[PDB]
Design an enzyme around this catalytic site. Sequence first.
Site, mmCIF file in Angstrom:
data_model
loop_
_atom_site.group_PDB
_atom_site.id
_atom_site.type_symbol
_atom_site.label_atom_id
_atom_site.label_comp_id
_atom_site.label_asym_id
_atom_site.label_seq_id
_atom_site.Cartn_x
_atom_site.Cartn_y
_atom_site.Cartn_z
ATOM 1 N N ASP A 132 0.850 -1.183 0.000
ATOM 2 C CA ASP A 132 0.000 0.000 0.000
ATOM 3 C C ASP A 132 0.888 1.235 0.000
ATOM 4 O O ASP A 132 1.900 1.278 0.704
ATOM 5 C CB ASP A 132 -0.938 0.022 1.211
ATOM 6 N N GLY A 521 -30.936 18.709 -20.255
ATOM 7 C CA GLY A 521 -30.311 19.504 -19.217
ATOM 8 C C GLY A 521 -29.621 20.745 -19.740
ATOM 9 O O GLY A 521 -29.275 21.642 -18.966
ATOM 10 N N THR A 607 -15.042 -5.148 -14.015
ATOM 11 C CA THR A 607 -16.360 -5.355 -14.588
ATOM 12 C C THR A 607 -16.850 -6.742 -14.198
ATOM 13 O O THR A 607 -16.049 -7.656 -13.978
ATOM 14 C CB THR A 607 -16.314 -5.203 -16.121
ATOM 15 N N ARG A 627 -12.736 18.258 -31.816
ATOM 16 C CA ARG A 627 -12.570 18.197 -30.370
ATOM 17 C C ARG A 627 -11.171 18.651 -29.974
ATOM 18 O O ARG A 627 -10.175 18.201 -30.547
ATOM 19 C CB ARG A 627 -12.836 16.784 -29.854
ATOM 20 N N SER A 651 -14.760 -7.860 -35.734
ATOM 21 C CA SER A 651 -16.085 -8.402 -35.432
ATOM 22 C C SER A 651 -16.007 -9.505 -34.376
ATOM 23 O O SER A 651 -16.318 -10.672 -34.622
ATOM 24 C CB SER A 651 -16.765 -8.908 -36.708
ATOM 25 N N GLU A 653 -17.492 -9.845 -31.018
ATOM 26 C CA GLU A 653 -18.704 -10.364 -30.394
ATOM 27 C C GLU A 653 -19.655 -10.969 -31.417
ATOM 28 O O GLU A 653 -20.345 -11.949 -31.111
ATOM 29 C CB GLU A 653 -19.408 -9.268 -29.595
ATOM 30 N N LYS A 705 -21.978 -0.318 -35.833
ATOM 31 C CA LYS A 705 -21.550 -1.129 -34.697
ATOM 32 C C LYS A 705 -22.512 -0.971 -33.531
ATOM 33 O O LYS A 705 -22.946 -1.960 -32.925
ATOM 34 C CB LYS A 705 -20.139 -0.732 -34.262
ATOM 35 N N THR A 790 -30.633 -9.107 -18.902
ATOM 36 C CA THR A 790 -29.832 -8.583 -20.005
ATOM 37 C C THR A 790 -28.348 -8.605 -19.666
ATOM 38 O O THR A 790 -27.513 -8.973 -20.503
ATOM 39 C CB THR A 790 -30.280 -7.164 -20.351
ATOM 40 N N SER A 791 -28.002 -8.220 -18.436
ATOM 41 C CA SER A 791 -26.608 -8.254 -18.015
ATOM 42 C C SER A 791 -26.051 -9.670 -18.073
ATOM 43 O O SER A 791 -24.938 -9.886 -18.562
ATOM 44 C CB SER A 791 -26.475 -7.684 -16.604
HETATM 45 N N1 LIG Z 1 -21.482 0.060 -28.706
HETATM 46 C C1 LIG Z 1 -20.694 -1.020 -28.509
HETATM 47 C C2 LIG Z 1 -19.367 -0.998 -28.914
HETATM 48 C C3 LIG Z 1 -18.563 -2.110 -28.709
HETATM 49 N N2 LIG Z 1 -19.083 -3.191 -28.125
HETATM 50 C C4 LIG Z 1 -18.266 -4.380 -27.901
HETATM 51 C C5 LIG Z 1 -18.573 -5.410 -28.976
HETATM 52 C C6 LIG Z 1 -17.264 -5.643 -29.696
HETATM 53 O O1 LIG Z 1 -17.030 -7.032 -29.912
HETATM 54 C C7 LIG Z 1 -16.214 -5.071 -28.774
HETATM 55 C C8 LIG Z 1 -15.045 -4.477 -29.544
HETATM 56 O O2 LIG Z 1 -15.414 -3.185 -30.010
HETATM 57 P P1 LIG Z 1 -15.327 -2.786 -31.560
HETATM 58 O O3 LIG Z 1 -16.256 -1.621 -31.767
HETATM 59 O O4 LIG Z 1 -13.879 -2.678 -31.946
HETATM 60 O O5 LIG Z 1 -15.992 -4.057 -32.272
HETATM 61 P P2 LIG Z 1 -15.335 -4.764 -33.552
HETATM 62 O O6 LIG Z 1 -13.968 -5.281 -33.176
HETATM 63 O O7 LIG Z 1 -16.387 -5.688 -34.101
HETATM 64 O O8 LIG Z 1 -15.149 -3.563 -34.601
HETATM 65 P P3 LIG Z 1 -14.378 -3.803 -35.990
HETATM 66 O O9 LIG Z 1 -14.225 -5.298 -36.072
HETATM 67 O O10 LIG Z 1 -15.322 -3.237 -37.016
HETATM 68 O O11 LIG Z 1 -13.083 -3.046 -35.841
HETATM 69 O O12 LIG Z 1 -16.878 -4.072 -28.003
HETATM 70 C C9 LIG Z 1 -20.433 -3.197 -27.726
HETATM 71 O O13 LIG Z 1 -20.914 -4.210 -27.183
HETATM 72 N N3 LIG Z 1 -21.208 -2.117 -27.924
HETATM 73 CA CA LIG Z 2 -12.238 -5.120 -33.065
#
Ligand SMILES: Nc1ccn([C@H]2C[C@H](O)[C@@H](COP(=O)(O)OP(=O)(O)OP(=O)(O)O)O2)c(=O)n1
Ligand SMILES: [Ca+2]
Lengths: 929, 350, 349
Positions: A132, A521, A607, A627, A651, A653, A705, A790-791
């Site tokens: 610590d 707001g 998480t 920005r 891609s 998930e 996405k 959902t979680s």
């Molecule tokens: N609004 C969002 C953004 C992201 N994710 C999650 C799902 C993805 O699997 C992960 C990775 O983020 P990316 O946006 O990079 O997802 P991809 O890897 O599919 O994007 P790409 O393959 O087009 O680069 O985050 C999610 O659940 N909801």
């Molecule tokens: Ca990705």
Amino acid sequence: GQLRHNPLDIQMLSRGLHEQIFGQGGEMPGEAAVRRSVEHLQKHGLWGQPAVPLPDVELRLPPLYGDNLDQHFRLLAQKQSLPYLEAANLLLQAQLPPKPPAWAWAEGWTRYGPEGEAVPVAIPEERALVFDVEVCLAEGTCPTLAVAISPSAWYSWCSQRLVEERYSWTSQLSPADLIPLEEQLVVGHNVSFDRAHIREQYLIQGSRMRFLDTMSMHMAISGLSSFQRSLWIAAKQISSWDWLDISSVNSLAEVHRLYVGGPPLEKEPRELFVKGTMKDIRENFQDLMQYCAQDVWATHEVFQQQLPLFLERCPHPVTLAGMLEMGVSYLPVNQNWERYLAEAQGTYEELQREMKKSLMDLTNDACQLLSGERYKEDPWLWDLEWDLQEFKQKPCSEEEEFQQDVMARACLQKLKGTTELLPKRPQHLPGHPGWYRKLCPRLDDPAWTPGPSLLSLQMRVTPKLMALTWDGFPLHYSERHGWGYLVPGRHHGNGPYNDVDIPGCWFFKLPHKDGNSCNVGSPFAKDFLPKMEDGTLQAGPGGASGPRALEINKMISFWRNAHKRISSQMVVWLPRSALPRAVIRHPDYDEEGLYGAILPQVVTAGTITRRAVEPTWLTASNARPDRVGSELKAMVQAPPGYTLVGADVDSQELWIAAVLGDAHFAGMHGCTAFGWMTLQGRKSRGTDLHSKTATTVGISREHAKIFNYGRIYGAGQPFAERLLMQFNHRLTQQEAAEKAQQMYAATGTESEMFNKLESIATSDIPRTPVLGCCISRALEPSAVQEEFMTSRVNWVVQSSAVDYLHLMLVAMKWLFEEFAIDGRFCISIHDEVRYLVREEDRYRAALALQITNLLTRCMFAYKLGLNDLPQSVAFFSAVDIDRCLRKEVTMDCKTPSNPTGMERRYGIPQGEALDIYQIIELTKGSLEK
Amino acid sequence: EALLEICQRRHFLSGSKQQLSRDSLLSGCHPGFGPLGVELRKNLAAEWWTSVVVFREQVFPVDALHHKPGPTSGKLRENLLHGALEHYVNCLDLVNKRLPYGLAQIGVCFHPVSIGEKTEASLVWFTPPRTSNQWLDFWLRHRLQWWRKFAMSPSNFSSSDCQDEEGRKGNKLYYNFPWGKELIETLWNLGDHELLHMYPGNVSKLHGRDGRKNVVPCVLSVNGDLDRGMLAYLYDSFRKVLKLHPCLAPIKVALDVGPTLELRQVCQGLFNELLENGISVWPGYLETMQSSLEQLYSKYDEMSILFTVLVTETTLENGLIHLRSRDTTMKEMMHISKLKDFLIKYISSA
Amino acid sequence: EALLEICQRRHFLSGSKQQLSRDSLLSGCHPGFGPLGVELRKNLAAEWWTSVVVFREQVFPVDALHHKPGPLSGKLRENLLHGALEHYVNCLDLVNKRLPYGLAQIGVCFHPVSIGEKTEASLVWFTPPRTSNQWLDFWLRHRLQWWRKFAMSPSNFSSSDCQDEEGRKGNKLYYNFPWGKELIETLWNLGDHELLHMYPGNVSKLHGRDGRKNVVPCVLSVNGDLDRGMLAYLYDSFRKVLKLHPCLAPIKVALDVPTLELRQVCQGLFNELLENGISVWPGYLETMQSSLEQLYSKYDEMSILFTVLVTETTLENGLIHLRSRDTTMKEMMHISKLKDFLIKYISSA
DNA sequence: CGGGCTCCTCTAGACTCGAC
DNA sequence: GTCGAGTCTAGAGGAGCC
Ligand SMILES: Nc1ccn([C@H]2C[C@H](O)[C@@H](COP(=O)(O)OP(=O)(O)OP(=O)(O)O)O2)c(=O)n1
Ligand SMILES: [Ca+2]
């Protein structure tokens, strides 16, 4: 023939790679499964579509140790994390004497033997510790004192800035200003913080010391969601409440109360290390060090109570190896970091004063409406405080000229002495009205600025000052229903509200991007810029005065919310001696430049899905032309002779959900319509699911996405309509609903994915379908019943992605160690892996990352039993090889604070994104030197 | 035409409407400015000096003669660049041959129109060629921020990248006058050609130090028009009020009395105090032709007077003096002892 | 001759040594001034302005062009009187038809020699004939007091009475240079002749309120030379030390010097001193270092009031070496009290 | 029924503490 | 001994990321 196809005519992995990975002996899916898949695909109209073959790849992969892939990964992870498990077990079998009564007042490290004798030592010299660190916040980021617990003896550390009183210390930190530590294991509660104060952790070359975290294991075992944390805190002061008795928030007091359940933890009421000076710490040294020792002991008890449970619920060694590898993040920086901070702050101040000039002019021009009581005729300012307070009351010759001057000065001095008549406390602008008083700082403020400097667009009076109107109706704020506008009368947008009861007027809320339930707001949000440009939202002055306020708000919104984090980032500047010879001898090396590093304070499992959590670097915006200070990640620049070689999984998930649904349906790739759609598509042709969605609906690929990932995890059709209307203004309410029905009622395409996810979620002990890691004890059906559905359903895919990251980290470390690849892990975003590799080994690192991705995809397939992997997702689309850190290797990072780009303002060129077909040619297909 | 008539009535611009043609003002054929105009120009010069020379460790003042003798007789100067470049070798000794360093000068230059006279502020910025573009960008941003921070509408101060007939990089600064955008400041990234031409022969004399490297500096020349800048600020400032900047208002405070003999001595003491402080004061306690308070308020608003100090009968009782600002039109009762600190803080923190 | 060499070396005067001569300096044909000379003349102008225009409600600035158009084919101006006389009519409305008033100006005047440019501080006083000599004597005494205020030897700032050919009372201020006495200022009582010549007829416009009656005022000329004043002060202030008065000396403090932390401390002190209005010579930027005796000699020949040294011991206690130009007495004082000490020292004199 | 995170600024309430 | 100016916490809404 390297080309291979499945019963569904999907191009599978090459023959050589399939023989090296899966060997032989696989079982055919069976006639019935193939018939079901063909029937489903023909029903959804996808069986007749053709596909262009992709070039085959022949690789001499590194020899896999085990009989198959899972055993190979287990052996790799056990080899990686074997010493650290032993150190943790050494902690599990440790007994210590009671803490010493007299802490040592000496600089450096002190070792406490039996009975409390203090012995000065250079380092603790141990294999497992509980650590610590206390830091005097008011003085800076330099560590103040630290207490460490080893199985043999206690250890205490005191800094040079606590034993010696000096007029001024250096504000640029150095390795000599950090705590000297270091196969070693360090355990802490928020160990990421305590890791950032170690002298040897800022070296460019890596070290063998790993860090274990109590919050991460708490989230792994019995963690809580953000809503769950809120409900837990509310209950400490949904019909399911059994999860309360087995869960707690990440606070060390609550965690110790949960896992140990002894006497309540003692917290210092003064909080000297946060709200105190160095003198207070010097006066209360014994008490503060005793509190630190108590926190260390509580952390040790919690670790002892947690480690067996974590090993039980996460028995795969890859999980532990990836959690250990995720805590060694490293971000190199240079003097360009200081220059970027200065430029961003300067641009922010310039834009802030540019906006405040107009705001102050409008306010000052409004004070004249007080005269004649003309505020009663102003629709915007008829309800403010216009009252004024009264003040609180309890040819002359040389001799003649001198006498006149003396008499005038004495008369002024005599009337100057009447200060005793007025009250001591000076009244704050009694003359001006109350709304103007609230906007002005007082003279006692050291940073006093003339005029109403305490004004911003976020305040509740700014739209009234700027006379913002919606469709010709002045804006009206309702405390119950947020912002809105007043329609004269006594229009249908967003519905009327009679709660305001304004005489002869109607109240309509402004259109919120997230439905009628939410309240606006501030009318200066990014969502109202299109409405300001169109003409529905207009300013009283008109012209460019109105839109410029929203533009500047968008420009400076990120820096306003992140300057404290970015500027306070703990940077330690390595001297020339600590730098490697390769950095010194490189042509890009600058003698007058600085070379340091920033260690992100990453919570490995912050998480319920066991994801990572960092306040700044996981929230760092990408470079944008609007920005201010959005080039934050672009300032993470590799040292001379080094390149940041990394890649992003494509891609993730989508593929995980598709493979789960396929494995549930039949043991082939592309069985379901969703799985077939996901596989059929390339990223160089713009036909992948994200690009296909971005083409079907005019929204961008990031919006695609968001849309897809929302639809996967339970977003309703109204949510889809709102998102489409937000990210594409050409669509009407009726037109946006047509595209919502076009991608929701036309799905079942994704029925098997839902079936598999609800099968895993409703199981008594949910586990990851790959590494078997269990869900938090506060989310099992026995504790939550039907709540948090959902979680829990999203947890399967998100924790599968975390397992993917763990596998990637383990495989990359194995490849780096085995073939002598000079590099180290830089930082991992939730689906990205950056590695600080030398320039001479960038293509070797790229090939290693491609092999790692192939192995991880094959592991995901094998653990589900598909016994094969398609060629479409067997390799990375492109591996980035860039000196700096950015989303794309071609963006030049043009910013209001960085207008000339990275190429002109700094010396950063543009990197290259290379695919496997090019990496193989660049390195002859071999990772060896 | 209201701005010109207000300038005439408040002694910013002299002459009648015949001499106040905007072409004459832009060209410099107009007569001299009024005392308030002189004070405004002096405030602009002081702010420019504070921003450019004072707070830079490598910028030094330079004195260039108003006439250039020799090749056939002499001529009057049109730019300050030549005289400043004439002192490069001499001023290399101050910074011990270190680069970058600058030479600054505010003066009057004559150009054909009739001879129009313009007050110009120049800065010759000797830089190594490696960072010449970086220094050009930095000075563009710095000078643009300097022009904008004294303006009620900074958006009317703009910039435009430009190329010379020889392809030399440069920038131009404009103010959006009611008729059009008129050039007020021009930055040119002149190479070593001017230095080599002015110093023919060995290039050893011109060798500055870029870190540990000898090099001939790249002449970054910054020239700004202060008469046109003052006119632009007068247009920007313009209930008829000239909302000039508090650091540019020609008259900071106007003291008036509302006991003839005693209040005279009180106002005289306050006058001497604020003056010794460093605050120029308009004496409003001497005007025999007294008028109502509203007329005085309008007159002080048109004169860009920040504050009107009122000493009344009640002041002798408790030391409280009324104080009205030009911004909110509200006056505040403050003690005499605290007036000097409040005025100094208001001026400095602006 | 030694003083001119020091001024050339220490950037009080620009140009080559051969170009700089006594006659060229006194005629305005010298190549110019160095940065230190420019700042010294700027301090002189500021002090003269504070003494004349400030502390008086009757003195106003003058904006006279460098050329006079119209038939005598324009010519460069030779004095600042004509601009004030042309502004006379409007300035009467400025003072609301009161009397008396003044029109003082500092500017560059062109005199044939070649073209000789001199920076002249003039004072055109418009007074009714009732109190002409009284105001003339008042201005003479005040100007002589201003000249003698900064002088180490105020006996060298002489004053004499001279009569012109036309027969008008006048005064001529002088400075006793080592070679002799040179004219640094001159006062005349010209009268209303010039104003009548410039405004023939319609004397109603020239009338001003001398109490109750309306009179046409006379013209008083108080014309001095700020360049000659700068030279006179340099000669009066001359161990090689230029003991300039603190209100005139261009540079007050010289700041010198673990390079990084010492540089940071010096930068903070430099910023504080500059923000508080004290000019500092940034000698800590120089990586090359010489003997402290050489630094002290350089700062003495540059008329620098104090030399401040930040060393290793400063980080520990905050004390800084302080050396005084006048007394050559070194002392240690806390770095947080240097600004107030310098401000008090300047205000004291 | 998007999910999982991060943190900010503003406003209201409660509280306290001193000044008269 | 009453009451206005700080202080602190908290909740809402906005805004970065994946
Ligand atoms: N609004 C969002 C953004 C992201 N994710 C999650 C799902 C993805 O699997 C992960 C990775 O983020 P990316 O946006 O990079 O997802 P991809 O890897 O599919 O994007 P790409 O393959 O087009 O680069 O985050 C999610 O659940 N909801
Ligand atoms: Ca990705």
